[PDB]
Amino acid sequence: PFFPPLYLGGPEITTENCEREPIHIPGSIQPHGALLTADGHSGEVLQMSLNAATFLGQEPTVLRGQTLAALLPEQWPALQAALPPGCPDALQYRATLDWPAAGHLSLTVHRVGELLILEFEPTEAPHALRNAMFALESAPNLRALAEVATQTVRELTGFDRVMLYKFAPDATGEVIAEARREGLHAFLGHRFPASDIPAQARALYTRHLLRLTADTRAAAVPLDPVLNPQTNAPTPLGGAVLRATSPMHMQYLRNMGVGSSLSVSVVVGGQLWGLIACHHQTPYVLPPDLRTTLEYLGRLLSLQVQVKEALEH
Amino acid sequence: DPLPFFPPLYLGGPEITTENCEREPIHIPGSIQPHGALLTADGHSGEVLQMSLNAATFLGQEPTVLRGQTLAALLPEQWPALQAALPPGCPDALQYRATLDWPAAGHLSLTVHRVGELLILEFEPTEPHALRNAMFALESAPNLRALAEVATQTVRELTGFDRVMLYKFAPDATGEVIAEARREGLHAFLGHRFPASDIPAQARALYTRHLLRLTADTRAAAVPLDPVLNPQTNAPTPLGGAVLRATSPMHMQYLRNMGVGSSLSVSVVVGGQLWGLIACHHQTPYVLPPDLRTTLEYLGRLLSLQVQVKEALEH
Ligand SMILES: *C/C=C1/C(=C/c2[nH]c(/C=C3[NH+]=C(/C=C4\NC(=O)C(C=C)=C4C)C(C)=C\3CCC(=O)O)c(CCC(=O)O)c2C)NC(=O)[C@H]1C
Numbered sequence: 001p002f003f004p005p006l007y008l009g010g011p012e013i014t015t016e017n018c019e020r021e022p023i024h025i026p027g028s029i030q031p032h033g034a035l036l037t038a039d040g041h042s043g044e045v046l047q048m049s050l051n052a053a054t055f056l057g058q059e060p061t062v063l064r065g066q067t068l069a070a071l072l073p074e075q076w077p078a079l080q081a082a083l084p085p086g087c088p089d090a091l092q093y094r095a096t097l098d099w100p101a102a103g104h105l106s107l108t109v110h111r112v113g114e115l116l117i118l119e120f121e122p123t124e125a126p127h128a129l130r131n132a133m134f135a136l137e138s139a140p141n142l143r144a145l146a147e148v149a150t151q152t153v154r155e156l157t158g159f160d161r162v163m164l165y166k167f168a169p170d171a172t173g174e175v176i177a178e179a180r181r182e183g184l185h186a187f188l189g190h191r192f193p194a195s196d197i198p199a200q201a202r203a204l205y206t207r208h209l210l211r212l213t214a215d216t217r218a219a220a221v222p223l224d225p226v227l228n229p230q231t232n233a234p235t236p237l238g239g240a241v242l243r244a245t246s247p248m249h250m251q252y253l254r255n256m257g258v259g260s261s262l263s264v265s266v267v268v269g270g271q272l273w274g275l276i277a278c279h280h281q282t283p284y285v286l287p288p289d290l291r292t293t294l295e296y297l298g299r300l301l302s303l304q305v306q307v308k309e310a311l312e313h
Numbered sequence: 314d315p316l317p318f319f320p321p322l323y324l325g326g327p328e329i330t331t332e333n334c335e336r337e338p339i340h341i342p343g344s345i346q347p348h349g350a351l352l353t354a355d356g357h358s359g360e361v362l363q364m365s366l367n368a369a370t371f372l373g374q375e376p377t378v379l380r381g382q383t384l385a386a387l388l389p390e391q392w393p394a395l396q397a398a399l400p401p402g403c404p405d406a407l408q409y410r411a412t413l414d415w416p417a418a419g420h421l422s423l424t425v426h427r428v429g430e431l432l433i434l435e436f437e438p439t440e441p442h443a444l445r446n447a448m449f450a451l452e453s454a455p456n457l458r459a460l461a462e463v464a465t466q467t468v469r470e471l472t473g474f475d476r477v478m479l480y481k482f483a484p485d486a487t488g489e490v491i492a493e494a495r496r497e498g499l500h501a502f503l504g505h506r507f508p509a510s511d512i513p514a515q516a517r518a519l520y521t522r523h524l525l526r527l528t529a530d531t532r533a534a535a536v537p538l539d540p541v542l543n544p545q546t547n548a549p550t551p552l553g554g555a556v557l558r559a560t561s562p563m564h565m566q567y568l569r570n571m572g573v574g575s576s577l578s579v580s581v582v583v584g585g586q587l588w589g590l591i592a593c594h595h596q597t598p599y600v601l602p603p604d605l606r607t608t609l610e611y612l613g614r615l616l617s618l619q620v621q622v623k624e625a626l627e628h
């Protein structure tokens with residue numbers, strides 16, 4: 001099973017109970033964005049991140065009464081149609097708001113049962129993706145495909161280190177390709193224990209295909225209330241990219257000298273084949289539109305891995 | 314019966330009938346569609362060899378001036394990028410794309426690929442979260458039918474085409490329309506089946522490697538290359554990989570007779586085989602700009618993946 005989260009007086013996580021930390025329900029988010037939850041029917045704002053006032057420019061109480069209808073007039077009917085009752089928690093809808101306080105915000109919404117989860121992040125506003133797609137497809141074998149993928153991602157993102165991280169049948173990880181800035185340790189060829197990404201983390205990565213710690217030293221921002229009014233239970237935040245990252249993991253990242261981390265899942269035959277794994281030495285918020293490019297690349301790599309593995313077997 | 318290609322018309326080959334169909338060399342027509350321009354150049358020196366006859370009007374230069382310069386001089390910023398992206402021996406399927414600001418012609422999209430020692434350069438005029446939203450909707454579709462319907466509707470919304478079908482090949486290469494989105498008033502092709510020779514076997518081979526072809530105007534005359542043969546080889550210039558390639562007069566006749574002014578289709582390739590097509594129709598001529606066509610190319614790949622996934626959920 002899972003332990004209760006901390007804020008419901010559950011045990012603190014150690015190396016004896018990695019497998020049981022409830023990472024989907026931390027009750028908090030990373031501070032480079034803001035999150036609101038809301039009722040599926042009424043559009044009634046039920047929870048907000050204590051930092052919402054910053055991003056939205058709204059007097060705190062104003063929000064926690066109001067309706068999405070009021071708050072987002074153009075958007076609220078689109079949401080209603082895009083995310084019908086009963087849809088999967090994996091389905092997401094995005095829009096760009098030109099919002100008074102903040103030039104442009106990206107809005108990302110998904111639905112978990114009766115709750116809409118809304119994420120707001122700063123945003124903005126060429127051929128590198130098309131060029132990359134053809135490059136991946138003409139790679140002659142899996143090894144070269146891995147090399148092209150890591151190089152392409154590094155060029156698109158500027159990340160200090162991009163790795164392709166392949167799982168063995170027992171969930172032992174091996175770095176099979178790597179693109180990195182001069183003057184970093186090489187992780188190419190190295191193998192790591194399964195428990196570095198515990199089973200409850202791998203399952204969640206099979207369904208929700210991208211996550212990140214924008215700053216390995218930033219404090220999480222609580223949800224208020226912490227419990228969903230609807231259920232008097234924790235809000236599931238696994239489908240939210242803003243979810244506060246595990247302190248266990250952030251301790252690991254910090255011990256490696258990483259300041260910013262991001263990964264993308266490569267899913268083949270319904271199973272987690274590997275990850276595109278990015279490190280930056282310093283804090284780094286990759287903007288939403290560039291993340292989208294990596295999300296596309298994730299799908300394309302999933303296709304090409306199967307194609308390429310089929311021409312060996 | 315499968316038989317080798319006839320020589321093209323310009324090398325004294327025969328004209329094509331319902332009989333010899335499968336031997337038309339549709340990859341070497343010696344000509345392009347008039348809404349863009351094409352140059353060929355030597356892959357090592359960058360000497361310009363062939364150009365479409367309309368090139369002066371896209372590129373704003375006399376032929377003899379174009380042909381008298383190397384790509385190093387014509388494309389000083391792109392020439393080194395081309396050479397890195399398209400190394401000798403690379404496959405003909407690999408494409409490099411850039412946007413140019415050309416004085417006389419505005420923003421041009423440049424698409425380049427390499428066939429042996431030849432570079433082929435295509436120039437076309439070029440111009441929010443719809444793709445991301447579509448990607449997730451496709452993935453959440455519960456079964457093959459719902460996927461097919463979401464895919465057709467999405468493509469129609471992105472493009473404005475009068476008719477978008479999902480055509481699926483059977484094992485005998487006979488095809489069948491399994492989903493479609495269509496303009497009000499058009500009659501339904503859903504569930505109809507069509508014989509295998511409607512897409513003869515050489516076209517289906519070409520459609521497995523080069524994943525998007527089109528006919529922007531089913532009545533437009535083709536524009537010859539000049540000279541027609543590659544001076545490197547005194548042989549035909551391979552245009553399979555060029556979207557500007559001229560369509561077979563057989564297929565343009567099959568289209569006009571249906572009332573179609575514009576045709577476009579994207580291959581859906583599963584396990585190395587052509588599974589089916591995203592085929593689109595418009596009643597009037599219609600040019601879809603290169604950046605919009607890129608969205609369809611990306612959807613072609615997504616759909617190939619999702620078709621595998623939906624079919625595996627099915628035994
Ligand atoms: C108690 C158990 C421990 C534990 C927990 C834990 N680990 C993750 C997530 C990740 N761990 C990763 C491991 C590596 N990244 C690398 O680059 C290398 C090698 C150089 C390794 C071994 C990765 C990639 C992830 C995914 C997240 C990311 O991309 O940064 C989680 C889940 C994190 C979250 O979703 O919040 C958890 C709970 N880690 C341990 O090391 C043990 C002691």
Ligand SMILES: *C/C=C1/C(=C/c2[nH]c(/C=C3[NH+]=C(/C=C4\NC(=O)C(C=C)=C4C)C(C)=C\3CCC(=O)O)c(CCC(=O)O)c2C)NC(=O)[C@H]1C
Nearest residue numbers: 331334339507511512516560561563564567576577578592
């Ligand atoms: C003697 C040869 C004939 C022939 C040849 C031919 N066909 C193509 C390409 C296509 N034919 C298609 C057929 C259909 N389109 C539809 O909308 C329907 C049903 C409603 C059918 C059956 C399609 C979709 C294509 C793909 C091209 C496109 O999408 O426009 C070629 C190749 C043309 C080229 O690539 O240059 C050729 C040579 N078709 C016949 O019917 C016979 C008479």
